Design an enzyme around this catalytic site. Structure first.
Site, PDB file in Angstrom:
ATOM      1  N   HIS B  41       0.768  -1.289  -0.152  1.00  0.00           N
ATOM      2  CA  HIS B  41       0.211   0.172  -0.108  1.00  0.00           C
ATOM      3  C   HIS B  41       0.506   1.013   0.118  1.00  0.00           C
ATOM      4  O   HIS B  41      -0.001   2.092  -0.191  1.00  0.00           O
ATOM      5  CB  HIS B  41      -1.000  -0.503   1.331  1.00  0.00           C
ATOM      6  N   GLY B 143       2.398   5.733  10.024  1.00  0.00           N
ATOM      7  CA  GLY B 143       3.768   5.576   9.786  1.00  0.00           C
ATOM      8  C   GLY B 143       4.505   4.146  10.118  1.00  0.00           C
ATOM      9  O   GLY B 143       6.205   4.299   9.934  1.00  0.00           O
ATOM     10  N   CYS B 145       3.453   1.779   9.652  1.00  0.00           N
ATOM     11  CA  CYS B 145       3.302  -0.340   8.845  1.00  0.00           C
ATOM     12  C   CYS B 145       5.138  -0.318   7.990  1.00  0.00           C
ATOM     13  O   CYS B 145       5.384   0.483   8.088  1.00  0.00           O
ATOM     14  CB  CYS B 145       2.431   0.443   7.490  1.00  0.00           C
TER      15      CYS B 145
HETATM   16  C1  LIG Z   1      -3.950   2.285   2.039  1.00  0.00           C
HETATM   17  C2  LIG Z   1      -4.227   1.741   3.098  1.00  0.00           C
HETATM   18  C3  LIG Z   1      -4.799  -0.136   2.981  1.00  0.00           C
HETATM   19  C4  LIG Z   1      -5.916   2.248   2.983  1.00  0.00           C
HETATM   20  C5  LIG Z   1      -3.718   2.382   4.961  1.00  0.00           C
HETATM   21  C6  LIG Z   1      -4.007   3.511   4.951  1.00  0.00           C
HETATM   22  C7  LIG Z   1      -3.694   4.466   6.215  1.00  0.00           C
HETATM   23  C8  LIG Z   1      -2.607   3.359   7.034  1.00  0.00           C
HETATM   24  N1  LIG Z   1      -1.835   3.690   7.977  1.00  0.00           N
HETATM   25  C9  LIG Z   1      -0.603   4.433   7.816  1.00  0.00           C
HETATM   26  O1  LIG Z   1      -0.268   4.897   9.015  1.00  0.00           O
HETATM   27  C10 LIG Z   1       0.209   4.748   6.771  1.00  0.00           C
HETATM   28  C11 LIG Z   1       0.112   3.816   5.252  1.00  0.00           C
HETATM   29  N2  LIG Z   1       0.731   4.428   4.893  1.00  0.00           N
HETATM   30  C12 LIG Z   1       1.605   4.858   5.810  1.00  0.00           C
HETATM   31  N3  LIG Z   1       0.965   5.359   6.953  1.00  0.00           N
HETATM   32  C13 LIG Z   1      -3.079   3.570   9.186  1.00  0.00           C
HETATM   33  C14 LIG Z   1      -4.112   3.088   8.729  1.00  0.00           C
HETATM   34  O2  LIG Z   1      -3.846   2.221   9.264  1.00  0.00           O
HETATM   35  N4  LIG Z   1      -5.356   3.894   8.611  1.00  0.00           N
HETATM   36  C15 LIG Z   1      -6.648   2.595   8.494  1.00  0.00           C
HETATM   37  C16 LIG Z   1      -7.887   3.127   9.769  1.00  0.00           C
HETATM   38  C17 LIG Z   1      -9.117   2.855   9.614  1.00  0.00           C
HETATM   39  C18 LIG Z   1      -9.061   2.947   8.174  1.00  0.00           C
HETATM   40  C19 LIG Z   1      -8.429   2.682   7.114  1.00  0.00           C
HETATM   41  C20 LIG Z   1      -6.705   3.333   7.129  1.00  0.00           C
HETATM   42  C21 LIG Z   1      -2.541   3.370  10.791  1.00  0.00           C
HETATM   43  C22 LIG Z   1      -1.709   3.806  11.340  1.00  0.00           C
HETATM   44  C23 LIG Z   1      -2.194   3.502  13.120  1.00  0.00           C
HETATM   45  C24 LIG Z   1      -1.460   2.289  12.446  1.00  0.00           C
HETATM   46  N5  LIG Z   1      -1.133   1.530  11.770  1.00  0.00           N
HETATM   47  C25 LIG Z   1      -1.734   1.820  10.570  1.00  0.00           C
HETATM   48  C26 LIG Z   1      -2.425   2.339   6.081  1.00  0.00           C
HETATM   49  C27 LIG Z   1      -3.354   1.522   5.700  1.00  0.00           C
END
Ligand SMILES: CC(C)(C)c1ccc(N(C(=O)c2c[nH]cn2)[C@@H](C(=O)NC2CCCCC2)c2cccnc2)cc1
Ligand SMILES: CC(C)(C)c1ccc(N(C(=O)c2c[nH]cn2)[C@@H](C(=O)NC2CCCCC2)c2cccnc2)cc1
Lengths: 305, 305
Positions: B41, B143, B145
Site C-alpha cells: 500500500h 507510519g 506500517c
Molecule cells: C492505503 C490503506 C491500505 C487504506 C492504508 C491507509 C493508512 C494506513 N495507516 C498508516 O499509518 C500509513 C499508511 N501508509 C503509511 N502510513 C494507518 C491505518 O492503517 N489507517 C486505517 C484506519 C481505518 C480505515 C483504513 C485505514 C495506521 C494507523 C495506525 C497504525 N497503523 C496504521 C495503512 C493503510
C-alpha cells in the site's frame, strides 16, 4: 492507537554486554571504551557472602584472575580497580561498538528499560520503574547480576542501573554506574528489607491521559478539585503527594486532551474511593503507575532513536 | 524471580530496518540480503485507498520512484515486484547486517516481539500475541506500517508479522513476510471488522504456573477435574477449548511445580466462577493470556540468544 509496556530498542546496549568470570562465579559486565564495569561481588566466594572484606579480597586478585569474554573472544584484563560497589576492569581492546553514552542516577518514579542477560548473552528486554522504596520489580534469575537499565535519548544511551541482587521479598536492588546503591541496600548476605512502597501518583495520572487519548473515557467525571483536597484523599490510599512540579510536567497531556490536571485529579479521586466496578482502563483492572508522562508522550507521538 | 512482559532483544532486527518512500507516503521496510520487503500500500495515494488496483498502480512505477534509505544512506532500487500484499524491492547493496533468519506464519495463540518503527528508525519494542481473531493488540501510530514482529531462536530470527494497518476498532492487522494477511482482512479502506475474540486458555494456564513458580499460590484449590468438565465451564466464559496437545505442551511447567494440568484446570475453573475477590496474581487483577508455555519456561529458565 493502542498502549503497551514499551521498552527502548536494545541493540546499542547488546553490543556492550560481556561475561565476567572470577573463580567459580560468572556474571555480566558492561564494556564501554576499554573499561568493563561489573558488580564487585563477583570476587566473593560462598564462604564470603555474610560480610565480605572487599578491599582484602581484591588485593589477592591479579588481572589474570579476571576472565572477560565478549561473545567467544577473550579480552585481556590489564588493570582492575574498585569504585564503590562496582569493579572497573581496564582491558587492552576498546569496544568498537561503544555508543555515545552517559551515566545518570535516576529519581524514584522514573522508568527505564532492562536488558536482562546471562553469561554475557542478552535474553530479554522489559520496562521498569525505580520504586519509591528504591527497589525495582524486575524479572531476574541467578546470574543476571550486571544486567543494566537504560534510557535512550536520540543517539545517546543514558545508563542508570546495574543489577546487583535480589532481596528475600523477591524485589531487586542495584547501583548506578558509579557503584552507589539505590536505597539503603548493601552487597552482602544480611538482613535488609525495603521500606513500604507507595503508588507513583503522577504516573497514574499520565496513564489516565493515555487512556483518554486512546478513547477509553468512561471514568471522567464532571467535577474538579483543589490540589490540597486531592492529596488528602490520595494520602489515604498510599499515593505519593502530587506537587506543582508534577502538574507542570503533565502539561503536554492536558493540552493534548483538553482535560485540566486538577479535573483529571477529581476523576482519579473517584476511582480511588469507589473502585472501577468491574470495568477496565487500557485493558487493566488496576491503576498502572509505571508510565511517566514522558513515556506516554513518546508512545503516543512516535519518538524514534 | 519476578515476571514481566519480556520481549526479545531487538538488535538483530534494528540493523534491518529501512525507510521506504513512494510519492508522499513514507513507511518502513525490512532489508535482508539485497531485498527490501514492505507493504504494497506504499504505492497508494489518498485518491486510491477505497479500492486500489495494485497491479495497475505498480505498472506506472519505475525503480527510481522508490526512495529507500538505510539511516542516511540511499540504497538504489534495481528491481521491484509484488508478492501478495508485500512489495519486494531488489537493491544494489546487500545488508551487511543480515542475520540468520527465516519467514514463518504463526498460529493464533502464539506470541512475538514487535519493533515499532517510524521513518525507518526504531522507537520501541514490546511483546504481542496473535489473537484468535487474527488481530494483534499492538501500539502503532501512523507510519508504523512495515514494522515487523519476530521471535528469536538461538542465533536465528524468525520473522512472522509485518504491520499493514489499523482497523476502526483500534486493533491491528498485517501479513506474514510472504504478504498473506492474517485473518480475513484486506489492504484497502473498506468495511472490515474482526470476529469476536476469545481467551487463550492454554496461555492463561501457563501464566498460573508462572505465578506458582514465583510464589503466588493462593488460588490453588484442593480439587481436580476432567478435561471435558473443564471445557464446558470455560466455554461459558469465552475461553478456547483446551486440547490434549495443550496439556502435553504444559508438561514442563507441571513437572517443575508438581501440579498436574487437570488440577490447575480445577483452580482456573474456580477463578472463572468466583472471580478473584480483590486479590491479584503476579500483580494483575485479571487473568493474563499473552504468555505461552514456552515464554514462561524461557523467562523462568534464562534462555539467551
Ligand atoms: C492505503 C490503506 C491500505 C487504506 C492504508 C491507509 C493508512 C494506513 N495507516 C498508516 O499509518 C500509513 C499508511 N501508509 C503509511 N502510513 C494507518 C491505518 O492503517 N489507517 C486505517 C484506519 C481505518 C480505515 C483504513 C485505514 C495506521 C494507523 C495506525 C497504525 N497503523 C496504521 C495503512 C493503510
Ligand atoms: C554475594 C552476594 C552479594 C550476597 C550475592 C549473592 C547472590 C546473588 N545472586 C546471583 O544470582 C549471582 C551472584 N553472583 C552471580 N550471580 C542472586 C541474589 O541476589 N541472591 C540473594 C538472595 C537473598 C539473600 C542474599 C542473596 C540473584 C538472584 C536472582 C536475581 N538476582 C540475583 C547476588 C549477590
Amino acid at each position: 492507537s493502542g498502549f503497551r509496556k514499551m521498552a527502548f530498542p536494545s541493540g546499542k546496549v547488546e553490543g556492550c554486554m560481556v561475561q565476567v568470570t572470577c573463580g567459580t562465579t560468572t556474571l555480566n559486565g558492561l564494556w564501554l571504551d576499554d573499561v568493563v564495569y561489573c558488580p564487585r561481588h563477583v570476587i566473593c566466594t560462598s564462604e564470603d557472602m555474610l560480610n565480605p572484606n572487599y578491599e582484602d579480597l581484591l588485593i589477592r586478585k591479579s588481572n589474570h584472575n579476571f576472565l572477560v569474554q565478549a561473545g567467544n573472544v577473550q579480552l585481556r584484563v590489564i588493570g582492575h580497580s574498585m569504585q564503590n560497589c562496582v569493579l572497573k576492569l581496564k582491558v587492552d581492546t576498546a569496544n568498537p561498538k561503544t555508543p555515545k553514552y552517559k551515566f545518570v542516577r535516576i529519581q524514584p518514579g522514573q522508568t527505564f528499560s532492562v536488558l536482562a542477560c546471562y553469561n554475557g548473552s542478552p535474553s530479554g528486554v522489559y520496562q521498569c520503574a525505580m520504586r519509591p522504596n528504591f527497589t525495582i520489580k524486575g524479572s531476574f534469575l541467578n546470574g543476571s547480576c550486571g544486567s543494566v537499565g537504560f534510557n535512550i535519548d536520540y543517539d545517546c544511551v543514558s545508563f542508570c542501573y546495574m543489577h546487583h541482587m535480589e532481596l528475600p521479598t523477591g524485589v531487586h536492588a542495584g547501583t548506578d554506574l558509579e557503584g552507589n546503591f539505590y536505597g539503603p541496600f548493601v552487597d552482602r548476605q544480611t538482613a535488609q528489607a525495603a521500606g513500604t512502597d507507595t503508588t507513583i501518583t503522577v504516573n497514574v495520572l499520565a496513564w489516565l491521559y493515555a487512556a483518554v487519548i486512546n478513547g477509553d473515557r468512561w471514568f471522567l467525571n464532571r467535577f474538579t478539585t483543589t490540589l490540597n483536597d486531592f492529596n488528602l484523599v490520595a494520602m489515604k490510599y498510599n499515593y505519593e503527594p502530587l506537587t506543582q512540579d508534577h502538574v507542570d510536567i503533565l502539561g503536554p497531556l492536558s493540552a493534548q486532551t483538553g482535560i485540566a490536571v486538577l479535573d483529571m485529579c477529581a476523576s482519579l479521586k473517584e476511582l480511588l474511593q469507589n473502585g472501577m466496578n468491574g470495568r477496565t482502563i487500557l485493558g487493566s483492572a488496576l491503576l498502572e503507575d509505571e508510565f511517566t508522562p514522558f513515556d506516554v508522550v513518546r508512545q503516543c507521538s512516535g519518538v524514534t532513536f
